[PDB]
Copies of this chain bind each other. A is one copy, B any other.
Amino acid sequence: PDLADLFPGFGSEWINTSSGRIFARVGGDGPPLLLLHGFPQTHVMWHRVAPKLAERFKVIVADLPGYGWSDMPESDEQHTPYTKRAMAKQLIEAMEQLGHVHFALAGHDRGARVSYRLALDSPGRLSKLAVLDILPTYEYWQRMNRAYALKIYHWSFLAQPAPLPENLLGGDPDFYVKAKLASWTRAGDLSAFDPRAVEHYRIAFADPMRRHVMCEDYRAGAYADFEHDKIDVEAGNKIPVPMLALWGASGIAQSAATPLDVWRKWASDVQGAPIESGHFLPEEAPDQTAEALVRFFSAA
């Protein structure tokens, strides 16, 4: 089953870290910009915006630890490697292997959780941060009500103790990944996605080890990630890095949000823009998303 090179001109780099390799497509030149995907995707989700960012930046499009073609560190009882704090530290190490100790960061979905956690933990690593269509994990859980529980049911479903989610996801993995992709778009189908991108997501999701990692991610997201976020809320720790919060008008941020109002509690300097899109901003609305990121990141 052959895939598709969706980043023409970009190189391919297996970045060695102490918890395993990070796969990344690297193109462009200029200030380093790391682009982090989320669930249930891989780096290829940036394929429509990364060329436009590559005009101005050294764009590093990385598979999250455990995701896509990045190595899968062995998990533990606390899902430590798939906590956003550990993923951020592994990505910091990955960026250091490239000589990037101060970089711009745009993240989407899980990658955006890594990204704001990275900004909280190691703010000196970031010139500017963009999070696409998330609120902090703390906020999703604190806003957990009937409406949210149904909308983001997978936050509780995938966090169930193994192997419950894994065994169920195995029941129809192709359906599940496609349903996630479709149900969070504005259209509600797969029409916003490049079918070559969908094949990337389908093949990653077709591996049980990969699905296990994603559940480890959401288990982290229910436990350690929430705890880590809680310490910051209760200690008043704000993200000091210049921040851009993008969200879809029909995405997984706007619901119980005003995402900018939420993010202003979390960051001292945050700008915000709704994007005519569902959750998958870079694929549903690439030009709009790319323009907003280019405008925000162009400086350095």
Q: Which residues on A are within 8 Å of B, measured CB to CB? A: 141-142, 144-146, 149-150, 153, 155-157, 159-161, 163-164, 167-172, 175-176, 179, 183, 222, 226
Complex Cα distance A149/B142, Å? Answer: 11
Q: With a CB–CB cut-off of 8 A, which chain B residues contact A157? A: 153, 156-157
- Give the number of times this chain occurs in the complex, counting copies: 2
Complex Cα distance A145/B148, Å? Answer: 10
Q: With a CB–CB cut-off of 8 A, which chain B residues contact A169? A: 168, 171
Q: Are B222 and A146 in contact (CB under 8 A)?
A: yes
Q: Are B146 and A153 in contact (CB under 8 A)?
A: no
Please give the distance in Å from A168's CB to the nearest CB on chain B: 4
Q: Are B167 and A171 in contact (CB under 8 A)?
A: yes
Q: What are 18 of the A-B contact pairs (CB < 8 Å)?
A: A141-B145, A141-B146, A144-B149, A146-B222, A146-B226, A149-B155, A149-B156, A150-B156, A153-B157, A156-B157, A157-B157, A167-B175, A167-B176, A168-B171, A168-B176, A169-B171, A170-B172, A171-B171
Q: Are B142 and A144 in contact (CB under 8 A)?
A: no
Please give the distance in Å from A190's CB to the nearest CB on chain B: 15
Complex Cα distance A169/B167, Å? Answer: 9
Q: Which of A145, A146, A160, A167 has the largest number of chain B CB atoms within 10 A?
A: A146
